[PDB]
C-alpha cells in the first residue's frame, strides 16, 4: 500500500442520499476488494445505517454473511463555528464472504 | 387497604410521541421505584430512542447512570393481516442509580 487516496475505502458516511446508493455501494465494495466495511452514521440518519445493512444480509449473501461489531454513543463533534455539540453517533462493521 | 395488585412496568414502546414526553416518563420510573428501564423502539424511531437516552444521561444523571446493554436487530414480527415483515428493532437497557 503505497497509494494514499483522501477518499475513505472501508468507512461511509450516511448522508442525504437514498438508501439504494448505500446498498450497491457496499456490494461494490466487497468485489472491489473491501471485505470488512464500516457504515457510519449519526443523529436520524441511524436508521438508513440499519435499513442499508439489513437489506445486504437479507438480500445478496444471508447465510455468508457476518457481523463483527456494533456500537452507538454520543461523539463530541465541532460544529461550523467551533461549538462542541453532541450527536449520536453508530458504527455498523459488516464482514462480508 | 386495597384489592388491587402492583403490576411490573419496566419496557417503553417508541411511538409518534415528542420526546420530551418520553424523557420525562424515563425519569418518573426511577422515581416510581425502576431503576432499571428498556426502551424498545423500531423502524425510524430508533432515532428517538438513543435521542431520549442521550438527553436522560446528559441532564440529569450524568456520572451515576449506567448502561445496561445495546441491541439491535431484525424482528420478524406480524402485519395487521398476519404477514411476517422484518423490521429493524432495538433494546435499550439503562441502569439508574
Redesign the interface.
Known amino acids: 500500500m503505497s497509494s494514499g487516496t483522501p477518499t475513505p475505502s472501508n468507512v461511509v458516511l450516511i448522508g442525504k442520499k437514498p438508501v439504494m446508493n448505500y446498498v450497491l455501494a457496499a456490494l461494490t465494495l466487497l468485489n472491489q476488494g473491501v471485505s470488512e466495511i464500516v457504515i457510519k452514521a449519526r443523529?436520524?440518519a441511524?436508521?438508513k445505517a440499519?435499513?442499508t445493512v439489513?437489506i445486504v444480509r437479507?438480500r445478496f449473501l444471508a447465510d455468508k454473511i457476518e457481523i463483527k461489531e456494533?456500537r452507538?454513543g454520543?461523539q463530541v463533534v465541532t460544529s461550523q463555528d467551533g461549538r462542541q455539540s453532541?450527536v449520536?453517533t453508530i458504527e455498523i462493521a459488516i464482514r462480508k464472504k
Open positions: 443523529g436520524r441511524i436508521s440499519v435499513d439489513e437479507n456494533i452507538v454520543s453532541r449520536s
